[PDB]
Amino acid sequence: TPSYSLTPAEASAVAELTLELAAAYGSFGDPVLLRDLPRLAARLPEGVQDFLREFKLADRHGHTVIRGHDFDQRRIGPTPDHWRGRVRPGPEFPEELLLMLYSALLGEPFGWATQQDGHLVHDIFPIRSHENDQLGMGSKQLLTWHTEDAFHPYRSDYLILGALRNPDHVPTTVGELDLSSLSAEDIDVLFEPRYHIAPDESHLPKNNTIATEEEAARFATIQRMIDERPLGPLLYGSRLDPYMRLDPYFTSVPQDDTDARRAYDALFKVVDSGMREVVADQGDVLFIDNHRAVHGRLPFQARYDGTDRWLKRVCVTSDLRRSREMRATSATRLLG
Amino acid sequence: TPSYSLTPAEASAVAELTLELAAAYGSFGDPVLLRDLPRLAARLPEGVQDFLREFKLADRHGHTVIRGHDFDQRRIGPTPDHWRGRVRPGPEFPEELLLMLYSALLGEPFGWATQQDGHLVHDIFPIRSHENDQLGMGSKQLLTWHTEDAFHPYRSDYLILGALRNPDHVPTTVGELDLSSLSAEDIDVLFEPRYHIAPDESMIDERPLGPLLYGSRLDPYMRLDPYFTSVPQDDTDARRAYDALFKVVDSGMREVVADQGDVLFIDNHRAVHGRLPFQARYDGTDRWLKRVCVTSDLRRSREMRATSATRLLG
Ligand SMILES: O=C(O)CCC(=O)C(=O)O
Ligand SMILES: O=C(O)CCC(=O)C(=O)O
Ligand SMILES: [Fe+3]
Ligand SMILES: [Fe+3]
Ligand SMILES: [Fe+3]
């Protein structure tokens, strides 16, 4: 698994660029910033650009990491108690800008209209009231591994996780598919439409408002997946180095499909066993290929005192226009 | 339709950039050129990058034009006799690199393994041999406008047409979808998978029925190729809605001339295009365009590509 370690010189250049842009641009509310992102990203050190371009085009490894960024702790400040009600942009705006630049080298940043107020850069930190929940803002509970939004046709192509702080070194579990561990007949079954991947509750049409004609048409395709329960493959792309979509919790193997349960169980075992602990420490940016890796996070104890683990997250789509039917306008990057 | 007209300073900077690039890299066969394309495209004039980015994100127009490029006719030399056996790269290499840079701003260049030797940059010029053929390469057409590879799930998202020369100002036909002249019921049936679009002659695959309009029902994208399109006889509503869509699209068609120095960008989701018939001289002074197809999501086509690294489908 290749990675890139910044020299102090590159770390200084990235930090300075990031402060400069933060000063020149208001917030992510400025549409000019979004327009400018790929041009701005070409101001990053070339070695960094070449590295991510190789990763993108290589289409072989499931994740990579850029380590050794300078994330100024004094400037960044305390890990917040909640994402809601914060002054925007925060003092950590330069770091958010950084992830956005990286997202533009990989594709287009996008988000979900009902998630964290539609923010393109998401927060990941413990919220006390959320501590008995299996979600990003949790802590005590294990977040079992998953492809992000496995059921969703317009799910992330990549995820970018940047760690502003991780004092106790809590790992992000990430897992890839070792194809040689699997029967070739098992592979054949996994490539076939035999599995049902259930849509997560937050993306449910009836989960949001049933108001008006168009706000209904925005969820018609997902509603159809719920209504019709099409079966789908778990593996796809090239038979020799397949993409995968695996979220064990939302996956049903039909009871009578004996070949499918044998094959799935084989796939589940292979991926579970291959799960790696990947610590995104302060100044690390983790890149996950959503078509080649699953990920999760191990339990941890929060202090709730402003010192807790704090990651930023950007989802990336290779083709913003594919999701048009789920977007309110052509300009919006938010699904729903 | 918004367009960008380059100052002489911009034209000179672009020309200089493409000559410098033409001398640094061997051909598109060099994998590092393909790697570097987006970084290299950031060396174009900022006004040009900004303009294309706006076109791409606005998702509002069927086409745009960047005009006033300096395409050095002496260096470029005579419009060739044929594409085959002709040596790559030719003296018009700077101009091909230019289209490749534009393609990296919009997405990723790709091609078809079987088309013109699988050259990432395609030639469009009158061939005496392939003359009175339907083919794009022959001097006739009618007005058989089309979405490019309308049948194909991995068809181009954009088409880039650079006019090296066009002495008799031969138009490209370009048409968008005017919704106002269509009923809501019709649009709804057009969104459903009730139509067949047959393949073209120029692995895997199936035989399904697909829709003609997709995306937003208020501002739809289209996959329309009238020639290869049929409707099950029994589906009278689908035939009705198809007839109305055809009439709306066919009647809104516009003639757009790609003059020397013009780069025409066609959004394959929002416009159909074609060519108009024209008398060719065949004397090396004929109209010559370069063409690059752009995919927004290269990885989506992985199953029809020989390797991870290849940009050629089929
Ligand atoms: O907290 C982490 O390391 C990752 C959480 C996660 O699963 C996500 O952001 O999708
Ligand atoms: O020559 C033209 O103007 C159009 C060419 C064309 O139809 C194509 O290459 O798709
Ligand atoms: Fe996740
Ligand atoms: Fe989700
Ligand atoms: Fe065409």
Q: What are phi and psi of A14, to 5 degrees?
A: -65, -50
Tokens matching residue A123: 């927060």
Q: Can you say how many angstroms the Cα of residue A175 is from the centroid of all Cα atoms in its chain?
A: 14
Contact B114, B203 (CB under 8 A): no
Spatial CB neighbours of B34, under 8 Å, sequence gap ≥ 6 = A57, B28, B109, B311
Q: Residue holding tokens 């890990």?
A: A79
Cα–Cα distance, B217 to B177 (Å, whole number): 12
Distance, in Å, from the CA atom of A296 to the CA atom of B101, rounded to the nearest integer, reads 38
DSSP A67: E
Of the candidates B112, B213, B284, the one whose C-alpha atom is nearest the C-alpha of residue A325 is B213
Q: Both tokens of residue B227?
A: 């020639």
Q: Which residues does B141 contact at the CB level (< 8 Å), separation at least 6?
A: B134, B274, B275, B276, B277
The strand pair at A196-197 and B3-5 is best described as unpaired
> Taking each helix axis from N to C terminus, what angle separates B93-106 and B31-41, rounded to the nearest 10 degrees?
70
Contacts of A38 in chain B (CB under 8 A): 38, 42, 53, 105
| Substitution target from B40, B187, B188, B216 for chain A, most A beta carbons within 10 A | B216
Distances (CA, A) of B220 to A214, B181, B187, B243, B270: 13, 14, 9, 17, 8
Element (H, E) at B224: none
Best of B159, B200, B267, B278 for a ligand 2 pocket test (most atoms within 8 Å of beta carbon): B159
Which residue of A39, A44, A316, A332 to mutate against B (max B Cβ within 10 Å)?
A: A39
Pairing of strands A285-289, A158-165: antiparallel
- Token pair belonging to B238: 């689908």
- Return d(Cα B153, Cα A265) in angstroms, integer: 32
Let me know: does A287 contact A64? Beta carbons within 8 Å.
Answer: yes
Strand partners, B276: none
Q: Give the CA distances from residue B15 to residues B11, B97, B239, in Å, rounded to whole numbers and listed in that order.
A: 6, 11, 50
Instruction: Give me the residues of B, 132-191, that contact A with CB < 8 A.
Output: 157
**Cα–Cα dist A205/A196, whole Å:** 18
Helix pair A93-106, A8-24: axis angle to 10 deg: 100
Task: Map tokens 């950007």 to a residue.
Answer: A314
- The token duo for B72 is 């050095």
Q: In chain B, what are the domains?
A: 1-314 (3.60.130.10)
**Residue A318 at interface with chain B, using a CB cutoff of 8 Å:** yes
SS (H, E, C) B39-104: HHHCCCCHHHHHHHHHHHHHCCCCEEEEECCCCCHHHHCCCCCCCCCCCCCCCCHHHHHHHHHHHH
Binary contact (B58, A237; C-beta < 8 A): no
Method: X-ray
User: Six-digit token pair at B26?
Assistant: 């061997």
Confirm or reject: Cβ of B305 under 6 Å from ligand 2.
no
Q: Does A324 contact B59 at a Cβ distance shorter than 8 Å?
A: yes
Phi, psi at A9, each rounded to 5°: -60, -50
* The dihedral formed by the CA atoms of B211, B215, B220 and B223, expressed in degrees to the nearest 10: -40
Backbone region of residue B267 per phi and psi (left: phi > 0; alpha: psi in -120 to 50; beta: other values): beta
Question: Whose CA is closest to A173, among A145, A132, A204, A202?
Answer: A145
DSSP A200: P
Residue B254's H or E segment, with its range, is strand B254-257
Say whether A216 sits in a helix, a strand or coil.
Answer: helix
Of B139, B152, B265, nearest to B202 (Cα)?
B152
Q: What's the longest Cα–Cα distance across chain A? A: 61
Going by the DSSP 8-state scheme, the letter that residue A195 receives in this structure is: B
- Named by the residue before each, gaps in chain B exceeding 2.5 A from C to N are 202
- Type of residue numbered B296: S
Residues with Cβ within 8 Å of residue A137, at least 6 apart in sequence: A83, A123, A124, A125, A126, A127, A130
- β-bridge pairing A108-112 and A334-335: parallel
Measured distance between the N- and C-terminal CA atoms of chain A, rounded to whole angstroms: 35
- The string of DSSP codes covering B132-201 is TSSSBTBS---S--B-TTTT-TT--SEEEEEEEE-TT--EEEEE---GGGS-HHHHHHHHSS-BEE----
Q: Are B154 and B304 in contact (CB under 8 A)?
A: yes
Q: Which residue has the tokens 């960044």?
A: A76
d(CA A281, CA B174): 53
Q: Rounded CA gap, B305 and B312, in Å? A: 6
Closest alpha carbon within chain A to B305: A238
Q: Using CB atoms, pick whichever of B50, B218, B303 lies closest to residue A35.
A: B50
Atom number of ligand 2 nearest to Cα B122: 9
Tokens of B13: 């900077």
Alpha-carbon distance B128 to B122, whole Å? 18
- Of all protein residues, the one whose alpha carbon is nearest to atom 10 of ligand 2 is B148
C-alpha to C-alpha distance for A158 and A106, rounded to whole angstroms: 8
Q: Up-side HSE of residue B221: CA atoms within 13 Å toward CB?
A: 20
First to last CA, chain B: 35
Q: In this structure, what is the dihedral angle of CA atoms B159, B165, B171, B176, given to the nearest 10 degrees?
A: 20
Does residue B52 contact residue B105 with C-beta atoms inside 8 Å? yes
Question: How far is the C-alpha of A58 from the C-alpha of A104, rounded, in Å?
Answer: 17
How near does any CA of chain B get to the CA of A336, in Å? 13
Instruction: For residues B257 and B1, give the distance between their C-alpha atoms in angstroms, rounded to a whole number.
Output: 13
- Residue (of A101, A96, A102, A121) closest to A110 by Cα position: A121
Rounded Cα gap, residues B18 and B264, in angstroms: 18
List A291's β-bridge partners, or say none: none
CA dist., res. B307 & res. B313, Å (int): 10
Structure-block tokens of residue B290: 């370069």
Query: Tokens standing for A150?
Result: 């496995």
List, in sequence order, every beta strand (DSSP E) within A154-266: 158-165, 171-176, 196-197, 235-238, 241-244, 251-252
From chain B residues 5-34, the ones with a CB under 8 A of any chain A CB are 34
Beta bridge partners of A289: A158
Q: What is the largest CA-CA distance in chain B?
A: 61
Tell me the helix, strand and coil percentages in chain B, rounded to 5: 30, 20, 45
What is d(CA A191, CA A160) in angstroms, rounded to the nearest whole number? Answer: 27
Rounded CA separation A146/A173 (Å)? 10
Chain A touched by B303 (CB under 8 Å): yes
Six-digit token string for A167 = 């004092």
